[model samples]
Target chain A: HMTLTELRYIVTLAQEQHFGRAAERCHVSQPTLSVGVKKLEDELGVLIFERSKSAVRLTPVGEGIVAQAQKVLEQAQGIRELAQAGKNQLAAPLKVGAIYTIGPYLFPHLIPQLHRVAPQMPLYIEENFTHILRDKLRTGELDAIIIALPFQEADVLTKPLFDEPFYVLMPADHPWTAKASIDSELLNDKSLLLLGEGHDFRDQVLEACPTVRKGDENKHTTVESSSLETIRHMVASGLGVSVLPFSAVDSHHYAPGVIEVRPFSAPVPFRTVAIAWRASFPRPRAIEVLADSIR
Target chain B: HHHHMTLTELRYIVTLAQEQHFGRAAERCHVSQPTLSVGVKKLEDELGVLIFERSKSAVRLTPVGEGIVAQAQKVLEQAQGIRELAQAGKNQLAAPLKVGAIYTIGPYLFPHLIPQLHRVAPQMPLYIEENFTHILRDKLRTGELDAIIIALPFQEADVLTKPLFDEPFYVLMPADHPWTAKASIDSELLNDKSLLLLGEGHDFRDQVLEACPHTTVESSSLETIRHMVASGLGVSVLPFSAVDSHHYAPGVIEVRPFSAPVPFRTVAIAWRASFPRPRAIEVLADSIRLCSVARP
Candidate 1:
């Protein structure tokens, strides 16, 4: 008649004699625990605890119900603990994933920051295309995944982490560098370098610059790459110009003018990254620490 | 009510999603079409989720069906994990590491990488797949592969890269070609001759183009371009590994190295940094190092 969670509310509140402290220990919100306790009392037709401003006390009838609740929770804990060794919030392997485009630039910053914050939590990392990472996140193969938003769905929730604008990248000697920023239309005549099929980055770039997409299928001198690093090299060689996520362009590298990265004019095309995961992955701490490290 | 679904039933839906046709999906699963159809119907009836929309022309997934199939695949993996637990205590190498390499590299490297590996661990389950870099990148991340050998400048995070060796570019031409008289061919001289190269969508084609010379003609493969050279159509620049054994033919094709500042590709072995088999990757990388003859 009652849920296991409602029963846990009775025992935990009894143990701490405080709703907020019990909620903290149970890894739930204070309002959530309060509602569960109130719902259980209503169903049983008896008050489980006497409320006060400073403290809480179990009533004569509440003590008996709470004793049995503790027994039930203890029995449940036996089954869970048998498989998971000491299931603490921040004590185990954390499998985090990101798409190919975001991973190379993001992890170079995120990993070390996480190491200092969560040294005990071993990190397991994965990088793949968005479609593959979607199901992998669903399967719990990865506890969390970083993805660009407007991504198609699976059974998951997403929260926006940050917004990143695309930049026009070209060889230092290219005449385009004389300008502060170039319009998306300027790419119509340039040899546009892009990642090949199955990359969301390519799709996003093509979506941003329609002038290049419908330019010419036959006369197009566009170059294709499987990775961003390769595209960077092509841009540096002056063979073609391309767009890059600013993070991947590397800060102050090659010093002088080996490569030039400039922003887009007017309406700047951008990608907002979000971390997606199934609710109750048992790793909110892992997710918070990782999301904190990004900025 | 929570009704337990069998892993067999879960597999039927996952395959049906992949095949997009009940007939072929059952064929791949090696079951009669009626049996697969009945099992899939039973799952939908019990779960009350319409997993597939049957049409005269095709079978397709419904919105709700996609989620069920995704969770079903996960359940199937858990079942696989249980079997893997039983498969433990066997020889580590007995469970062959699934290795992948790109099309450009596999043809030249595997003939050597495999034999040297066989000499060390002879029990026979070294799986290898030759595909494109994009496809290989996804597989290595999902544990479908243990390691991948690809051209350098791969910059994915949480991946380990160990440089196997450097493979330099060499010029291939007819024996009597004028450039063959020189000790080494200059990069600038390649522009003077009619250059033949592999057709578009080839990383090797683009990498070689960086050295110089526009392609006068293009062929489907390096070997076909080599034939064009043998026929004296034009000269082509190829990797050293590609021209090694083929050059033995008398006057068929002559190979020459690049002069002064040579252009070379550093081929490397890459694996997921979180991969469980570092020792296996080490031996695999070391084996290729020994068999590699085109070292820079």
Candidate 2:
């Protein structure tokens, strides 16, 4: 007996865990959101959330209902996207999600190319963590996502864009700067700088050089930075050496006296950057064009 | 605005796919057969797709129907998870922790570990299911089980594992067997001896094959392998945990450690990376680690 609009209100409430925030997210007043959710609970003959003076929490059943509601909303959005794709194809505005780690470096070049390939199509882009981007893509809020690979999910189809190799970054005066190309084993004794946890790049770097990770007796100093730019700046200041993706490295960005970049020998560390979309997504032509432009 | 499809209809179709019969599906959904059929027909009309094909004898899903049913199952599972998350937050370990183990490891580990787990966390009830390694991994991924214990070197994209202990393999033989006279037997010696192993599809069997690629005989159970070795059919390799747990008849079977660089399986506990009940899983893992040391 519940309407899709009511379901949306509850799902937003569950996500935000705050009535006022949920109302703001749904573009409705607090009382309207409350009334809508109350109606749903009344119809379902179960309490979805327990409200107190300080906090709001979902009851056990409320969690289940909200999860199902998310799927229903996703499918409903898919139907609309399918219709829109049939009518307009590449002419419609595309909603794309890209991870923060890759977006800043890749999008500048990628965007201009996209405009050249499909000038009629306008892009609406948002950046977030890879996991968040994946969730948004699945819920039809994003038509596709550009991220690093090894992200395996059942209902998503990924198309490889290209492998972006990692280069070792260090201060200009460092001893390793004299080498034409560095061996991976040379990093065993050097202090390593990495992005903080939750970044897939951190894991990839650790995987590339197992000896540099924690619990290794040979491991030197390890420092954590908030972003790739921060790591670059720290490396520039001679704090420690770090790794940077190929797309993120531009000689002009760092002053000549500050930092130096060197590639690893054969079988260098690299990440496969790919474009992924829901397997059931309807806008295949747009996705194809976007992938082609990026490649 | 007109409604496209109701939750009731989705539930009916999902149940029908599971039961594969209209009458039974309707009963499960707590609706009459006609009502369920009409609901499904209405859904088909709205979606403009044939979800199921019905005959006098059996009901089968169309290709599209299979996809729809799979999505429906996901939706239902999420709904279930929401409820479970709430309950878990409120009650913590009051609810039973569903644990899965592989057939090769469960019998050796559970009998001793379960009682220790009860002692560690009295309020935490344990529900155990024994299955093959791959099936247990799938079940854990789908949220059917909260955690699983298995041998290591297994990697799945979204599962997290913590190593518990190393279980070394030893040669099991009849007491009077010539190998028992030696302090330790070299793995290469197994090249001339027929090795008894568990039936195909067991990962342990694959490990043994990797260690000694020779003529191997297969039996269905580890206990059977023990009996076969006792009868002098052939020598078999058994994990230290299994051999330690087994009640060997006096002077019937001789268990000898392998020589230097012995092949050992790393026992570990695994759970879905996104599991909601982290405290329960952590407690369970801690109990497992504690009991493993006590027994080892």
Candidate 3:
């Protein structure tokens, strides 16, 4: 069997392509280096190098295997650093998975605060759906997930970050905005415009306006799109009113004559933004640091 | 910072907090009885914790680092697992592609290919993979290339192949060669001849083989192959689009067509399946689809 030492030696040799030079670089004698390369070839059942009097070249098969070797080396190096870093302070990159709906609207405001508070911590952010972020958190691929929840993973811990209320967006002349306080029941018969599926906010909208169920019996006839901006534009065009997250509406001010953001009556519809991490992970301090930073 | 220990040691104290058994937990941890005992003693001092009930055989956490270690273990272990997945998704083309191809097909083909792919997926990243097949495939497979414009018949299992067009393969031979005076040469005469092949792994080498299966191939790079043929080493092949007014020595390598089969490598957009930049791939695929004549 070829050892990691043998793989490392061959990988360097393939990269440098000079026998004596590769040996010198590896800090081993030329014969030992040659034997290492030969042993690798014997184990894999494929010769990696074609030697000439003047130059050494990678065989076609060698080219493919070398690529895979690079990936292996990268992973090994990453783990070594992580293990070493674990003994002291927290140093590993934080894989923070966030939902797109919250990401564009909320992160920009929160991230700057995070950076100011915890300058040493590095955050790797990914924007995706809530379910997608949850799966990434469970798989250990994500260190922490920030999204609007009611995510109840069995072994996961959750910390509520903030509560963002839902606001009704409609054209300036829309009948609902004429009232100082719009009734939730009044929105039932109204054709509610909404960004397409995968956003939890969409469910919040459906819950707020249950009467909407009968209005759009032709689900196919209703507006279905992914762009939130398009939804705002459609409402602006006097097509129909839609519900938007408070953060999203606040972040991108509703354009004049395009859309008007209105507050719901007492007990405003809202979603709690929370940070969840696997129970087995280390860094309540780091999570606290993130929570405090976002807050 | 200098303390060194195995990953098993970390998972043990973590498991012991839940398991609370020295003998059984040590066995579950895959370490001998004494080893786990000693490992915990060393860690207790470092962490300053009475992490277990030594007499009761019940393991538990010391107050201060208990909550800290629990959180650290989750981040470290998962970070460790995610890091070690050794995923192939980290290739060069994984980023949004901003490819720059040398002039020629860029203006004509890209506009045609971008919208067809956009109809299916409107927000794909821009593509610039069109270029000499050799550099494109080399970059694409290594992750630098999201896609490329090249002739094909090359089969790399890792690469997803999409046939786009057939550009004519123009043959360049020494004028003195028997068929240089004629319009083209037959496969029978070309067979067993020492043809100057491009350096190993160049897509053109595969194209030459596609042109004349029986021809003997001795690999050399593009420039080397051209120079060798000009020096009268042997005949070579290149794309018709590439061959123009100034090519090869005056009377040395002559341009001719291959008889009947009329050999040419089909230009296709090749990319790794895990490439994250689908927009670039689709845009490049569409560009290639627009550039070619109907596939024969």
lDDT of each: 0.74, 0.77, 0.62
Alpha-carbon error at A206 in model 2, in Å? Answer: 73
lDDT of 3 at B57: 24
Candidate 2 lDDT tens digits, A120-221: 888899988888888898666888999999877767889989999999988999998889887877766547777666788877876776454466644644
lDDT of 1 by residue, B1-296 (tens): 25435557777988888677788889988999999998988777666546675433457565456545544544444334323332333444656888898777887888887887888866635789987787787566444567899989886655789988898889988999998898899998877547886767567877887887456454367777877788988898887778775645587778899997899888899986535446678778888898866454
Model 3: per-residue Cα lDDT over B1-296, one tens digit each = 24433345556666565455677778787888788888876755554434443434234343334443443343333323222232334433334454533223344345555566556445445656445544554454333444555445555634677877776766667668776778877765555465666544555565567566424344434456556667777776766655543445477667787787776655565665544445566655664565333223
How displaced is residue A196 in candidate 2, in Å? 72
CAPRI quality of model 1: incorrect
Candidate 1's C-alpha lDDT? 0.74
Model 3 chain A: lowest-lDDT 10 consecutive positions:
A213-222
Kindly report which residue stretches of model 1 are placed more than 4 angstroms away from their true locations once superposed. A1-295, B1-89, B95-98, B126-128, B138-146, B156-160, B216-219, B272-279, B294-296
Which stretches of candidate 3 lie above 4 Å from their native place? A1-92, A210-224, A253-257, B1-296
- Between 1 and 2, whose TM-score is larger? 2
List A-chain TM-scores for all predictions. Answer: 0.68, 0.66, 0.64
DockQ values, each candidate: 0.02, 0.06, 0.01
Residue-level lDDT of model 3, residues A1-295, one tens digit each, is 3344666677888888888888999899989998887877776667777855677888876776665556545543443453344453344456798886677776787777877766677889888888888999977688898877788886788999889888887888888777776666656544666655787777776676535444563232135665566777787889887777877785555556656778888778889999899765645567777778787
Q: What is the TM-score of chain A in candidate 3?
A: 0.64
lDDT of 2: 0.77
